[PDB]
Design a binder for this molecule. Structure first.
Ligand SMILES: Nc1ncnc2c1ncn2[C@@H]1O[C@H](COP(=O)(O)OP(=O)(O)OC[C@H]2O[C@@H](O)[C@H](O)[C@@H]2O)[C@@H](O)[C@H]1O
Ligand SMILES: Nc1ncnc2c1ncn2[C@@H]1O[C@H](COP(=O)(O)OP(=O)(O)OC[C@H]2O[C@@H](O)[C@H](O)[C@@H]2O)[C@@H](O)[C@H]1O
Ligand SMILES: [Mg+2]
Ligand SMILES: [Mg+2]
Ligand SMILES: [Mg+2]
Lengths: 432, 313, 24, 48, 48
């Protein structure tokens, strides 16, 4: 494999890609040699990792917390554009799976149901799944789901981006020292290293190691992960859906950052721990059903104290305040209960989270077409018809009709044609 | 099942003979020295630190021979704007409505004892306790800085129209602004200007902060003006208390008059276009409960609002 | 839904301390 | 065993609102002509 | 399943699956197998 000397990075205007040298592009990424350092030094830790029993190699980039998420997004787009050509399959959904790294311990039936929902959503929307980069818990489970997904696909394989805090990775020392294009470096998960003990997941297709000058400290990559997903969502005009299953304190921080950046979250109720805390908080503040009338702030505080173990009143107050701050906006939180509600209603919750956003109206109809929910699209169109807004409907009806034709959904074709979509006024995406 | 619950709490829940048995559970732990002491670092002051005091050493009745406060006045206040009193506080009459440049200023405290005047320099002494710091600090007026707070409320309702109920009481929702200076959520409001009353001030601060309509967006429609006037025509003063504001000193303290504008039907509240302006970053509707972490003593103000409206807290 | 509305307005709606801010 | 911090808070919340409903003479079989039991009755009602 | 208690369920699920097999109740066999009863971890009542 011949090492790349030049890379194709897409311009900030979004009209074409200009070709430039790799060292010029990679100068914008920084590393911290120590905690005291603020300005930093050039990173020089990027290349490809080879995992045992995996045919393809996985990219890694060590960046700093102060680095722009658009630059990391340009890096992911530039690699995919280099490998698969300009017309690679763009994502219409960014699915963030977060939760417990070590404390995740869940019944198998519950795991299969969550796995089934994630597999169908991912396979129907060609989603980019961004989880934590480590080989533990929900990240490992999501990795297994996308491992099975990677076999039936023929051309395009959706990236499984792993964003992990650098400094906890056992092969971190071996990746940084050396020349700047490291082609095919072997990653050894069983290799001994005294200070760090957390290995990378072998089923993830790409890796962003966020560094802030810290050894064995977690949760430093949360803000950048939320910002990177939000940046990706703006760039591809695709909704970002965060999914919360179980989780510890950093999952609470992940959900808090996600709700602050406008990204909707899907909380899996009944899986225990932080997900139960978030679900309890949302149900206390918003749910009008009879069984939630006995919900109190005291019982919520008891749940936070029993789950997170804050060991002080101020920490407990901050955790409770953060949990209540997550479920402040009722549109941005969708609570799915695993036990009481049905098995095939998880995608409806994901679609409800997509529909709960403000913009990307053509795209929301496209997501409704992907999940095969004709009634949701019909209700949205009827409400849109009653609410005026004729210019945006006419602007997106042609592209929606075109998209419905491409994915073989005749019911959507008849529905879009009934709502003043002229059959002879369609336009192609590219220019001949 | 909702109606069954509603009829059950309307029929079961509709000093003399009252006993407290919490001493059997707790012991020597009870309500002891329930008094506010402001934080050591003064906000926006460039690192000047107060003189640290314990919470059992705050009230004036208790003796304090080791009291050595620091004299600090902020540069903005010391530059002499229109809303700031003169640096020599002599000839100013406290505890009665005083006219400065032909404009009326309140200057009366809600404390039963009143404001005591130091004989040596003529500066007022805070009756609500010691704060370990003399001078005016960030506050422009000697003595009582009158603030008006605007709690615009509506019942928290679901999409079906039913009012949300927690702990057998109806749940409220109030307009809250995020402050520019310390980034903690708070009730919209501001200091009472010279020559004006609480009526103009409460309404003006709510439009400037919560709505951002203080020369920063656009002119309201005739029905939007009529709706906002209808909302603002029925207000009840729920409390007039002493603020637990971190900018309080021994010679300048904030005292608030709280005005509640409650929208019972919810029609007038739904027409408000919330957008943080002036000294507010973001404005949003936020559920009223006892676990709220708000700036100064706004939780006490919300307690007074829920007490008056028989709402959840 | 009519009964729900009726019970809600019978329980929420059953000079001194009265302020007029229409001047603002 | 020692109670939890939320169990102590719940029991204190229960015990913070008590009403003396009666102060009567007991019909106690141990009563004599020179020693009799008189009760103060305290009701702790949990409405919720 | 909702109430935790994973040790007692795992301790009795094998014997319940075994009992379901003995009395010819296939619906109970499928139901017990769906709730984390490993098919190859059954044990006989007596000792050979
Ligand atoms: N990303 C991680 N990978 C591996 N181990 C971790 C991680 N984060 C924390 N740990 C360690 O594992 C222990 C258990 O973590 P959990 O409580 O299960 O999860 P949480 O602490 O919330 O962190 C989970 C992490 O997953 C990501 O999706 C999210 O960014 C969050 O940081 C913690 O004590 C912590 O020290
Ligand atoms: N007497 C005064 N003291 C201090 N600042 C004043 C005064 N009068 C006007 N100002 C100006 O008003 C600005 C403060 O903005 P406001 O909204 O008017 O006041 P705010 O900061 O909201 O403080 C009042 C808030 O404190 C709470 O104790 C009280 O409940 C109220 O919510 C200051 O920067 C200053 O320039
Ligand atoms: Mg203000
Ligand atoms: Mg003001
Ligand atoms: Mg103001």
């Amino acid at each position: 494999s011949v090492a790349a000397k030049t890379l194709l990075i897409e311009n900030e205007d979004g009209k074409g890609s200009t070709r430039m040298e790799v060292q010029d592009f990679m100068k914008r990424f920084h590393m911290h040699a120590s905690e005291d350092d603020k300005t930093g030094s050039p990173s020089t830790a990027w290349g490809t990792l080879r995992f045992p029993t995996k045919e393809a190699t996985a990219p890694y980039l060590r960046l700093s917390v102060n680095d722009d998420p658009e630059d990391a997004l340009l890096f992911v787009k530039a690699m995919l554009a280099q490998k698969y050509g300009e017309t690679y399959d763009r994502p219409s959904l960014i699915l963030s799976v977060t939760g417990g790294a070590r404390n995740f311990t869940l019944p198998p039936r519950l795991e299969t149901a969550i796995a089934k929902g994630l597999r169908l959503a991912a396979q129907r929307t060609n989603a980019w799944v961004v989880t934590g980069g480590t080989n533990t818990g929900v990240m490992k489970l999501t990795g297994q789901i996308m491992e099975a997904l990677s076999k039936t696909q023929s051309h395009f394989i959706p990236p499984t981006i792993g964003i992990a805090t650098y400094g906890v990775i056992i092969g971190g020392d071996d990746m940084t020292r050396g020349e700047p294009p490291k082609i095919g470096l072997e990653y050894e998960m069983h290799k001994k290293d005294p200070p760090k003990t957390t290995p990378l997941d072998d089923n993830h297709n790409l890796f962003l190691l966020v560094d802030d000058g810290s050894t064995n400290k977690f949760g430093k990559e949360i803000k950048f992960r939320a910002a990177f997903e939000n940046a990706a969502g703006q760039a591809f005009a695709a909704p970002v859906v965060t999914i919360v299953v179980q989780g510890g304190p950093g999952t609470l921080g992940t959900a808090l950052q996600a709700v602050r950046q406008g990204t909707p979250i899907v909380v899996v109720d009944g899986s225990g721990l932080a997900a139960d805390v978030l679900a309890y908080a949302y149900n206390f503040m918003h749910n009008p059903l009879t069984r939630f009338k006995s919900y109190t702030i005291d019982d919520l505080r008891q749940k936070v104290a029993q789950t997170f173990n804050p060991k002080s009143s101020q920490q407990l107050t901050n955790l409770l305040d953060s949990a209540l701050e997550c479920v402040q906006d009722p549109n941005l939180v969708v609570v799915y209960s695993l036990q009481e509600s049905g098995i095939d209603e998880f995608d409806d919750c994901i679609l409800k989270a997509i529909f709960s956003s403000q913009g990307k109206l053509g795209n929301k109809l496209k997501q409704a077409m992907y999940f095969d929910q004709l009634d949701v699209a019909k209700r949205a169109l009827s409400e849109a018809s009653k609410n005026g807004q004729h210019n945006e409907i006419a602007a997106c009806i042609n592209d929606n009709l075109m998209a419905a034709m491409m994915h073989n959904k005749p019911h959507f074709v008849e529905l879009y044609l009934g709502f003043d979509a002229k059959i002879y006024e369609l336009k192609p995406s590219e220019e001949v | 099942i909702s109606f069954r619950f509603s009829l059950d709490q309307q029929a079961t829940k509709i000093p003399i003979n009252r006993l407290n048995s919490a001493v059997a559970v707790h012991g020597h732990t009870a309500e002891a020295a329930e008094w506010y002491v402001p934080p050591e670092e003064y906000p926006k002051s460039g690192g000047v630190k107060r003189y640290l005091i314990d919470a059992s050493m705050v009230p004036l009745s208790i003796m304090c021979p080791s009291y050595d406060p620091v004299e600090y006045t902020h540069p903005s206040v010391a530059a002499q704007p229109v809303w700031a009193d003169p640096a020599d506080p002599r000839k100013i009459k406290f505890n009665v409505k005083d006219e400065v440049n032909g404009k009326v200023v309140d200057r009366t405290s809600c404390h039963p004892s009143g404001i005591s005047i130091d004989s040596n320099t003529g500066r007022p002494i805070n009756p609500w306790g010691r704060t370990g710091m003399t001078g005016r600090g960030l506050l422009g007026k000697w003595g009582v800085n009158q603030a008006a707070d605007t709690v615009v409320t509506r019942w928290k309702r679901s999409p079906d129209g039913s009012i949300l109920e927690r702990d057998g009481k109806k749940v409220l929702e109030f307009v809250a602004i995020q402050r520019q200076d310390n980034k903690m959520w708070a009730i919209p409001g501001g200091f009472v200007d010279n020559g004006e009353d609480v009526a103009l001030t409460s309404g003006r601060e709510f439009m400037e902060e919560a709505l951002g309509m203080g020369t920063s967006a656009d002119l309201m429609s005739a029905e939007s003006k009529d709706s906002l006037a209808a909302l603002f025509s029925s207000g009840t003063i729920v409390a007039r208390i002493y603020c637990e504001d971190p900018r309080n000193t021994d010679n300048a303290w904030v005292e608030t008059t709280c005005v509640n504008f409650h929208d019972e039907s919810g029609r007038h509240a739904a027409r408000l276009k919330l957008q943080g302006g002036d000294d507010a970053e973001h404005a949003r509707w936020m559920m009223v409960h006892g676990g709220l972490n708000l700036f100064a003593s706004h939780r006490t103000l919300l307690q007074h609002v829920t007490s008056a409206l028989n709402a959840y807290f």
